Design a protein around this ligand. Structure first.
Ligand SMILES: CCCCCCCCCCCCCCCCCC(=O)OC[C@H](COP(=O)([O-])OCC[N+](C)(C)C)OC(=O)CCCCCCCCCCCCCCCCC
Ligand SMILES: CCCCCCCCCCCCCCCCCC(=O)OC[C@H](COP(=O)(O)OCCN)OC(=O)CCCCCCCCCCCCCCCCC
Ligand SMILES: CCCCCCCCCCCCCCCCCC(=O)OC[C@H](COP(=O)(O)OCCN)OC(=O)CCCCCCCCCCCCCCCCC
Ligand SMILES: CCCCCCCCCCCCCCCCCC(=O)OC[C@H](COP(=O)(O)OCCN)OC(=O)CCCCCCCCCCCCCCCCC
Ligand SMILES: CCCCCCCCCCCCCCCCCC(=O)OC[C@H](COP(=O)(O)OCCN)OC(=O)CCCCCCCCCCCCCCCCC
Ligand SMILES: CCCCCCCCCCCCCCCCCC(=O)OC[C@H](COP(=O)(O)OCCN)OC(=O)CCCCCCCCCCCCCCCCC
Ligand SMILES: CCCCCCCCCCCCCCCCCC(=O)OC[C@H](COP(=O)(O)OCCN)OC(=O)CCCCCCCCCCCCCCCCC
Ligand SMILES: C[C@H](CCC(=O)O)[C@H]1CC[C@H]2[C@@H]3[C@H](O)C[C@@H]4C[C@H](O)CC[C@]4(C)[C@H]3C[C@H](O)[C@]12C
Ligand SMILES: *C(=O)CCCCCCCCCCCCC
Lengths: 171, 86, 63, 156, 173, 459, 128, 122, 275
């Protein structure tokens, strides 16, 4: 669910981005960006929420009519030219467990460090599970938010795959 | 594509905000809440995030962008996406 | 470095190819077939010594 | 592990079967709707919206990011057709019917004009190209024994 | 090597060089480099090999097949006579395939040799190719994958009957 | 053929008398030695077939099928020994025995001189095949798969038995050499229509013919890996080999009796190729791919031209190596993730680089990249079918487009994209797995150098 | 007063253009909360396995098993012969076969008729 | 250009048909017309291996150009005068084809002018 | 083949007029040039079609390498709307890009002139489909427009890329690879044109207007393109038309066919063939 305020702010960002795609030139875009902001400021204070909803629906219809058919997309954003370009290089860390001993002997320092991380994960796991059991209602979790660590020497529950995820430029 | 550093990210984030006419450069620090301290509204914050996307060349999704309320949170968000640790 | 490349990748391959063509391919019929050379008026045939006659006098156009 | 009670079954006839089916598929009983009970064999499988996986939020933390699926959610019957490599159903900036009319109109117009241009070709104001020796009768592979009809060209 | 009558080629006519330019001809100097660096060492190695072969000279023979009675002379269901006739017919069939291949190879060598004048200068090769393909088609076309001498004979007699019928009604006219 | 039959029989005492821990080493080594000696069958003559005795012979049709058969036995032992590792010793030895007995029946099947000897061995292959599917298959569905396999085959083969005995009573012999000289044309009567169907339906079911193929997606999918390898590589080719032989005595009736089966095959290949695009089970997709390829062999055999017969022989050999390789590739993923679902494990190229090369090579041969023998066979059939009727090029062309689509869809879905996050047991490829794949593809590509030895008697 | 959006099977209505998205009663809010609860419960069940340090294998997904089962084994038990299935099966099953039979039978009969009359060009046709 | 408008958007009876011209006899109005001279013999063009479409009434200039090009190698900027003679010979051949078209058009006009005059008599 | 090539050259040139991805513009340029080669086939000029293949290889390859140089310097940005102001920042890529564009548009005596201009002359003087001839000429003008589009937005104006400037085209591998193709884009057409043997009879007699058609429409194309591009810098709003959307979305062919055909085929596979 998106609140009304979230819907308006998403529209404002979308409208500006498509406006920038039309205008291209920076000085021209600055001019029309300020006219568009003025339109949003014109109804900033509209206490009637039935009328503020009607204004929102018409703005979205106006946007769909005016959207650029081929808007600018940041290269690495979904739909961009570089989106997912480096996924083929992302290898999960568990693959290192299958390395041959002669391959591990080339990085004695890296693998000694890695064993400490795996030991840390092993020793934290029981407390992470217990913390989730005790902080979760009887019906079960109602949102996807996870809690922090409440104690000293505890780790935030379910941290391993966030912390150890591949780098964005893994190779 | 030279590498980013934590100080470098912070320097450029604060640099952009000091070019925004609605912010007083003499009252701007890394922990200045955009709304509570600098007295900006939520339309201003959308424009601030858009500038950061332009500054660093990548998109911040609206669901994440709405929570970035101070310069330090912007720095941390960028650092996390770019795997910057120093 | 370039000379070691020329020797291993040009000279030796062309030796093998030339030996292959001269003593295996061209010893069989119709393996290598050349378009016969063009002959122009006034030419001389190397094989025979025949001399090809010239073309007749041109009705000299203005140019 | 999977038991028979966790597997798809026949079309649910009673509201008690519909609730049991919805729970099995991890759906709200109000959101659960089977395919019509024709003879085509869907049983009680949920009829989900016919939307491409391309239509799902790319910024959400999917369990299967490439498929944009979460573990345990009911898969569309035609999921393998709606993967991001195949059929896309995203909204288009131009209406579907208007796109079809403009594409068809452009192609039909071009085909018509090509047919016109073939009926009324462009050419230069020159008579036919002339060739010696009976229009090159022998060069074109003419029978050396048969005598061709003379083709005589004149100055002008 | 090969017989020049089976795989003929006309005499070669090469125009002599007749330059009208002071510039050196790069091909002439590349040709001499090729002879010295490539053709010469390759020729020496070949001569060494041909000396070894001359020390050990042995022979192989082209197998000759005696002619045996053909299918027309075989009595029905007589497998021993049919077998020898059928094997002979298959050997002849494979030979006829190679004859067509020889005639096709002549035709293709002519088209390439004559360049832009091939349409006129290859008329003889085209005529011979046409005649052999007609004869081959008459013998073997449409017999099917299970072809045999018997089916070939049946096809010939059907054709001979048609040619005999087309004559009595072409001599009646 | 006794120089191959007796050594094959000796594989059984070798297996039973071996040390407990050497059953796989011993049987694999000596089955490879038998496969090596089979190259002596390549003494073929231009006119006459190689006729050993009253019982057995080998011509250019059966020789390549024999070499493929004997080659497959060591590959199947390699493919099986991992998933049978926890089986107790006696049951392992019985599993190997079934494989050996199947090889014995097959090599005698392909060289039988007399069609009734061919029949007995042709049915004999059912028994070990059924036992392998039902005893050592993994799922509950193996029992149902065995019944479909058994009764589809027998429903067709029992009418064939009546027909063959009828022919022997009328001709006096079923010896294949004799039938070449004593064959008489088939008059067009109702009684001969059912003789034609009796002589052909058993082979059609084994191909399988589209419509009569439902047993194959069950049997090929439920069998253990060795079962699938032999089922697809060799046993489907008994139908093609039988049809190529028996059509000798069915002319000219085949001219018009072929039409319904040509339509089923030409349209069926497009149907089964389309099915592959929406299959969710990787093994099931590979099984439906076989039906599409064998539809070309049926069509090629029925139009009865020298080019279609060369193409059919090449396709049967080419498909045998390719389909077996694909099953082995699919099995190697199954032994890791224990599921046959194709969408389950993705992006495997990232985790198993070399194995992804085998997938690519297997896929390219499946879609008939030139100059592979897969393409040579398919091309020769397309050429002959164009002469049968120019319009067939449309159906052949559409099938080649669809075949490329599902071949690369299988490659892209499993090997590319992002790996599945929670699957963390994809260990590196074993030397055994890599050798198993290369013993398929290496002979397949080598044959491109000397294709004539797999073009059959019409070459 | 802009022209209205006309959706199709292959081009969906944009979410921002959907009238339902803008009238959100409490019952709709409650439904969304119930959906999030189911997703959250499933996410937790997956994560407790996915994050378990000792687990090595595949996390079996019942939804994936149900999907493959529904697309194969469950179809015939829920099939009923009726007007819809009988007609479609006849039209898609037999239809193409009868059509292609008459295309090839017609083409081959015409071609055969020409060959018997010597009216088909087969001058160089010796491969078949 | 202009001639296409007249045929397509005007009277097509007094415009040549490019696929059927000439339609009048070669001597109609041309007393004692000379035949075109051909310099190169059939054997010379065969020996030179000219492309058949090049074996026209300008072939002798082409042969002279081809011989020069071969003999001037590697100087590919030579034979520029030989090339021009062939280009100019082809230009004159093209003008002769333009005159044939213009002659055909004027006879079609003349033919009509006679019909109307020979019809206004009736 | 004449009509097939004519529709291709026109349709893909029109798509190129509105594309913003630099590689898409060059790709649609290739399709349009291939269409022109197919037209040359259709007017019975196979040796001119071959020559265009040879000349096109030089400057088209160079253009992609120049775009690759720009893409690399702007951290994988391929949208020309985020380029600008590169004329002096990347002098060598600028030089190659201008030479490449002038070669593509048929500037006299560059590599593209020695094939494209003979092709247009041969088409204009041929017994040919009238509509195909017009489509070809218009496509020739559109070639100037989208060539101007790349130069105007990539090189001229003010920078529109991000603030951290990492523009660097000083790698010798980059310089020498482009440099060799630049030399080919100037002289290869002249050298190949003067060394190949004549296999047809070139048409050299035509009215003045049919002799300069290729050059005139190219100049008109540059003029019109330069008026459209300067218009983009006027503080005036945008009103997108049907033609702009048709061009931008590639005539809707991908949007319809790549959804409708897969949907129909994949639905049948499961519903009918499988189930
Ligand atoms: C047993 C399996 C089914 C096939 C057996 C043979 C046909 C039986 C079914 C038809 C009986 C009526 C015959 C009508 C008739 O005149 O013959 C067919 C007539 C032609 O017959 P006809 O009158 O020219 O006679 C044929 C020539 N003689 C008599 C010398 C053998 O029409 C056809 O060609 C249609 C063929 C029918 C079969 C179509 C494909 C198979 C359909 C059955 C599938 C079963 C599952
Ligand atoms: C042919 C015989 C018919 C049967 C065989 C062909 C099968 C066609 C149907 C394809 C079946 C589906 C296979 C899977 C392909 C698929 O679903 O992917 C869809 C793909 C998406 O591509 P895209 O639009 O770029 O989306 C990218 C998102 N950013 O989009 C695609 O890549 C698929 C595009 C296929 C569309 C084919 C259209 C054919 C048009 C031919 C007309 C011209 C006829 C010949 C030339 C004219 C005469 C000169
Ligand atoms: C000539 C061309 C040939 C090519 C065309 C061939 C067409 C295909 C023929 C298919 C044959 C029938 C199908 C065989 C598949 C296996 C059958 C099966 O598995 O059905 C299961 C069914 C369920 O019952 P059940 O399995 O017993 O329950 C569990 C306890 N075991 O089991 C049962 O209910 C009992 C099944 C009994 C049938 C067994 C098979 C016998 C087939 C021959 C039929 C005999 C007809 C004789 C009738 C003459 C008088 C009319
Ligand atoms: C299920 C249970 C029912 C099983 C089917 C019942 C038998 C069907 C009868 C088919 C008719 C075959 C027949 O009876 O032909 C008899 C014919 C007798 O003639 P004969 O004296 O021997 O020789 C001179 C020719 N008049 O004999 C002959 O001339 C030739 C006979 C050849 C042997 C035919 C063997 C029977 C084939 C029946 C199955 C064939 C069709 C397979 C399935 C078709 C596809 C669905
Ligand atoms: C889905 C189940 C899978 C199992 C499939 C089982 C297939 C069994 C097929 C058995 C049919 C055998 C044919 C029996 C009919 C009698 C044949 C006969 O003797 O008729 C002769 C006549 C020949 O015609 P003609 O070529 O003109 O004569 C020579 C002069 N040129 O007859 C003719 O005109 C020749 C044409 C005969 C073929 C007719 C084809 C019908 C249309 C195609 C149907 C495809 C198969 C349909 C299967 C659906 C099953 C549900
Ligand atoms: C040829 C046969 C053509 C059949 C025509 C259609 C017959 C029909 O429509 O009968 C309907 C009847 C039941 O009708 P009803 O119970 O009233 O259903 C109403 C709810 N819709 O239907 C029935 O209950 C009887 C079942 C009829 C069986 C139809 C047989 C044809 C089905 C297609 C077979 C496919 C053959 C495979 C071909 C090989 C390639 C796949
Ligand atoms: C950077 C290095 C290149 C700088 C070159 C500077 C310009 C050189 C131009 C020389 C010149 O002005 O003479 C032109 C000459 C033709 O002679 P011209 O003088 O015009 O005839 C009139 C009589 N006075 O022109 C000539 O002599 C021939 C053409 C000269 C230019 C070509 C230079 C060689 C480049 C070869 C690149 C080939 C790349 C393609 C490779 C594939 C070929 C298959
Ligand atoms: C000629 C080239 C030098 C390029 C350069 O320095 O700019 C060098 C670079 C690397 C060389 C090659 C590689 O070293 C691999 C080869 C190994 C052998 O020692 C010589 C042949 C061999 C095939 C090489 C000879 C060649 O001279 C190469 C290609
Ligand atoms: C007579 O044969 C004329 C042949 C063709 C005339 C072409 C003249 C160019 C006019 C239209 C070009 C428009 C391009 C924008």
């Amino acid at each position: 669910y998106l609140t009304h305020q979230q819907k308006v702010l998403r529209l404002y960002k979308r409208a500006l981005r498509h406006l920038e795609s039309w205008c291209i030139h920076r000085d021209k875009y600055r001019y029309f960006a300020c006219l568009l902001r003025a339109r949003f400021d014109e109804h900033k204070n509209e206490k009637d929420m039935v009328k503020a909803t009607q204004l929102l629906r018409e703005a979205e219809e106006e946007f769909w009519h005016g959207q650029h058919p081929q808007p600018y997309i940041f290269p690495e954003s979904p739909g961009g030219t570089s989106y997912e370009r480096y996924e083929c290089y992302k290898v999960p860390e568990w693959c290192l467990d299958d390395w041959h001993p002669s391959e591990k002997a080339m990085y004695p320092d890296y693998f000694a460090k890695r064993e400490q991380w795996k030991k840390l994960r092993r020793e934290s796991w029981e407390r992470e599970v217990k913390q989730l059991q005790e902080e979760t209602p009887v019906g079960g979790p109602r949102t996807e938010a996870l809690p922090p660590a409440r104690k000293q020497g505890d780790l935030p529950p379910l941290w391993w795959h966030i912390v150890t995820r591949p780098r964005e430029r893994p190779m | 594509a030279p590498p980013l550093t934590l100080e470098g990210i912070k320097d450029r984030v604060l640099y952009v905000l000091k070019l925004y006419d609605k912010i007083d450069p003499e009252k701007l620090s890394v922990n200045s809440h955009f709304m509570k301290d600098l007295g900006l509204d939520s339309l201003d914050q959308v424009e601030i995030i858009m500038a950061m996307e332009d500054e660093f060349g990548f998109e911040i999704p609206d669901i994440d962008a709405e929570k970035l309320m101070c310069p330090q949170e912007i720095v941390d968000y960028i650092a996390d996406k770019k795997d910057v640790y120093e | 470095r370039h000379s070691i490349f020329a020797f291993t990748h040009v000279l030796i391959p062309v030796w093998i190819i030339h030996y292959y063509l001269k003593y295996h391919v061209t010893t069989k019929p119709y393996t290598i077939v050349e378009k016969k050379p063009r002959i122009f008026p006034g030419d001389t045939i190397l094989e025979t010594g025949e001399v090809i006659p010239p073309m007749k006098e041109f009705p000299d156009q203005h140019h | 592990h999977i038991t028979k009670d966790m597997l798809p079954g026949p079309y649910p006839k009673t509201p008690e079967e519909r609730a049991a089916a919805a729970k099995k598929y991890n759906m709200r009983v109000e959101d659960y709707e089977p395919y019509p009970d024709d003879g085509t064999g869907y049983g009680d499988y949920p009829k989900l919206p016919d939307r491409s996986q391309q239509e799902r939020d790319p910024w959400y933390d999917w369990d299967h990011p490439d498929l944009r699926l979460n573990w345990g959610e009911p898969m569309h019957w035609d999921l393998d057709m709606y993967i991001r490599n195949r059929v896309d159903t995203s909204p288009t900036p131009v209406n579907w019917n208007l796109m079809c009319k403009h594409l068809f109109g452009f192609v039909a117009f071009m085909l018509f004009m090509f047919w016109v241009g073939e009926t009324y070709p462009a050419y230069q104001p020159v008579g036919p190209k002339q060739y010696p020796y009976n229009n090159l009768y022998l060069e074109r592979g003419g029978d050396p024994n048969k005598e061709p009809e003379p083709v005589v060209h004149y100055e002008i | 090597s090969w017989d020049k009558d089976v795989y003929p080629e006309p005499p070669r006519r090469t125009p002599a060089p007749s330059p009208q330019t002071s510039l050196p001809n790069p091909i002439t100097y590349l040709t001499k480099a090729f002879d010295l660096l490539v053709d010469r060492p390759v020729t020496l190695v070949r001569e060494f090999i041909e000396r070894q072969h001359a020390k050990n000279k042995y022979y192989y023979y082209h197998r000759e097949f005696r002619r045996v009675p053909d299918i027309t002379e075989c009595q029905e269901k007589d497998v021993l006579c049919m077998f020898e006739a059928e094997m002979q017919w298959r050997r002849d069939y494979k030979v006829d395939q190679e004859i067509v291949n020889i005639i096709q190879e002549r035709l293709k060598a002519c088209q390439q040799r004559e360049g832009e004048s091939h349409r006129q200068n290859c008329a003889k090769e085209l005529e011979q190719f046409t005649q052999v393909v007609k004869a081959y088609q008459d013998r073997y076309h449409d017999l099917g994958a299970h072809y045999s001498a018997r089916k070939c004979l049946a096809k010939q007699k059907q054709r001979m009957l048609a040619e005999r019928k087309a004559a009595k009604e072409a001599a009646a006219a | 053929m006794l120089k191959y039959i007796i050594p094959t029989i000796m594989l059984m005492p070798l297996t039973w008398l071996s040390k407990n821990n050497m059953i796989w080493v011993n049987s694999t080594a000596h089955s490879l030695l038998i496969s090596f000696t089979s190259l002596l069958l390549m003494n073929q003559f231009g006119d006459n077939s190689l006729n050993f005795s009253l019982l057995f012979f080998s011509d250019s049709l059966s020789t390549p099928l024999l070499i493929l058969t004997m080659w497959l036995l060591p590959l199947m032992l390699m493919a099986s020994q991992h998933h049978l590792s926890k089986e107790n010793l006696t049951r392992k030895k019985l599993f190997i025995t079934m494989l050996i007995s199947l090889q014995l029946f097959l090599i005698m099947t392909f060289t039988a001189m007399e069609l009734i000897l061919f029949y007995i061995l042709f049915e004999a292959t059912l028994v070990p095949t059924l036992i392998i599917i039902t005893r050592w298959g993994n799922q509950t569905e193996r029992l149902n798969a065995g019944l479909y396999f058994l009764f589809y085959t027998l429903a067709g083969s029992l009418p064939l038995l009546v027909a063959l005995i009828y022919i022997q009573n009328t001709v006096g012999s079923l010896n294949f050499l004799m039938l070449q000289y004593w064959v008489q044309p088939v008059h067009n009567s109702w009684s001969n229509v059912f003789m034609w169907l009796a002589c052909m339906m058993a082979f059609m079911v084994k191909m399988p013919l589209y419509g009569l193929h439902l047993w194959l997606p069950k049997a090929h999918v439920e069998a253990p890996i060795a079962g699938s390898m032999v089922l697809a590589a060799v046993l489907l080719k008994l139908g093609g080999y039988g049809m190529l032989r028996i059509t000798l005595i069915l002319n000219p009736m085949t001219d018009f009796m072929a039409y319904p089966f040509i339509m089923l095959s030409l349209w069926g290949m497009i149907m089964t190729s389309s099915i592959c695009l929406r299959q969710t089970d990787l093994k099931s997709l590979i099984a439906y791919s076989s039906v599409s390829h064998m539809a070309l062999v049926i069509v090629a055999i029925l139009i009865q031209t020298p080019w279609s017969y060369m193409g059919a022989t090449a396709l049967m050999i080419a498909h045998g190596l390719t389909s077996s390789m694909l099953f082995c590739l699919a099995n190697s993923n199954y032994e890791r993730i224990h599921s046959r679902t194709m969408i389950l494990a993705r992006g495997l190229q990232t985790l198993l680089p070399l194995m992804a090369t085998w997938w690519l090579l297997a896929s390219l041969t499946n879609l008939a990249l030139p100059p592979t023998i897969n393409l040579i066979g398919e091309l020769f059939v397309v050429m002959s079918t164009f002469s049968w009727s120019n319009i067939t090029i449309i159906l052949m062309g559409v099938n080649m487009v669809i075949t490329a689509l599902y071949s690369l869809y299988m490659l892209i879905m499993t090997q590319r994209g992002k790996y599945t996050y929670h699957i963390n047991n994809i260990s590196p490829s074993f030397t055994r797995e890599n050798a198993l794949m290369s013993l398929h593809i290496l002979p397949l590509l080598l044959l491109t150098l000397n294709p004539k030895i797999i073009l059959g008697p019409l070459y | 007063s802009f022209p209205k959006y006309e959706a199709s099977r292959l081009s969906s209505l944009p979410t921002t253009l959907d009238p339902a998205e803008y009238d959100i009663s409490s019952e709709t809010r409650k439904a969304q909360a119930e959906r999030l609860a189911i997703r959250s419960r499933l996410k937790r069940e997956y994560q407790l396995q996915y994050y378990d340090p000792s687990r090595r294998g595949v996390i079996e997904d019942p939804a994936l098993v149900r999907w493959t089962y529904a697309r194969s084994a469950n179809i015939y038990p829920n099939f009923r012969p009726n007007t819809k299935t009988s007609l479609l099966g006849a039209l898609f099953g037999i239809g193409p076969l009868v059509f292609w039979y008459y295309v090839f039978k017609t083409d081959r009969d015409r071609k055969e008729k020409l060959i018997q009359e010597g009216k088909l060009d087969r001058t160089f046709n010796i491969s078949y | 250009g202009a001639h296409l408008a007249r045929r397509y958007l005007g009277d097509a009876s007094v415009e040549p048909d490019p696929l059927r011209m000439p339609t009048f006899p070669p001597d109609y109005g041309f007393p004692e017309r000379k035949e075109r001279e051909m310099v190169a013999t059939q054997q010379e063009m065969n020996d030179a291996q000219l492309v058949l479409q090049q074996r026209d009434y300008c072939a002798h200039y082409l042969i002279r150009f081809l011989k020069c090009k071969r003999d001037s190698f590697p100087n590919f900027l030579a034979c520029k005068h030989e090339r021009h003679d062939w280009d100019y010979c082809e230009h004159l051949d093209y003008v002769k084809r333009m005159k044939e078209f213009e002659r055909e058009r004027r006879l079609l006009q003349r033919k009509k002018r006679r019909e109307q005059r020979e019809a206004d008599m009736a | 083949t004449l009509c097939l090539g004519a529709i291709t050259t026109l349709f893909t040139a029109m798509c190129a007029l509105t594309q913003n991805d630099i590689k898409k513009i060059i790709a649609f340029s290739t399709s349009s040039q291939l269409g022109l080669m197919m037209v040359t086939i259709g007017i019975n000029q196979p040796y001119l079609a071959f020559l265009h293949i040879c000349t096109h290889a030089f400057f088209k390859a160079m253009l992609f390498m120049c775009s690759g140089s720009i893409i690399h310097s702007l951290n994988d940005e391929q949208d020309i709307r985020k380029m600008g102001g590169l004329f002096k920042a990347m002098p060598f890529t600028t030089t190659a890009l201008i030479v490449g564009s002038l070669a593509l548009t048929g500037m006299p005596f560059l590599t593209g002139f020695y094939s494209k201009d003979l092709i247009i002359e041969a088409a204009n003087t041929s017994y040919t489909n009238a509509w195909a001839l017009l489509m070809t000429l218009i496509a020739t003008s559109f070639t100037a427009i989208y060539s101007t589009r790349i130069i105007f937005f990539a090189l001229l104006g003010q920078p529109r890329f991000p603030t951290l400037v990492n523009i660097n085209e000083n790698n010798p591998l980059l310089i020498n690879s482009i440099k060799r193709l630049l030399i080919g884009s100037l002289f290869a057409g002249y050298i190949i044109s003067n060394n190949i043997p004549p296999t047809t009879i070139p048409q050299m007699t035509m009215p003045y207007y049919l002799k300069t058609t290729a050059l005139i429409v190219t100049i008109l194309g540059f003029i019109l393109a330069l008026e459209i591009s300067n218009m983009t810098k006027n503080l005036k709003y945008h009103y997108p038309s049907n033609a702009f959307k048709f061009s931008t979305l590639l005539g809707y062919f991908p949007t319809i066919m790549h959804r409708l055909a897969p949907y129909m085929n994949l639905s049948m596979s499961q519903k009918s063939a499988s189930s």
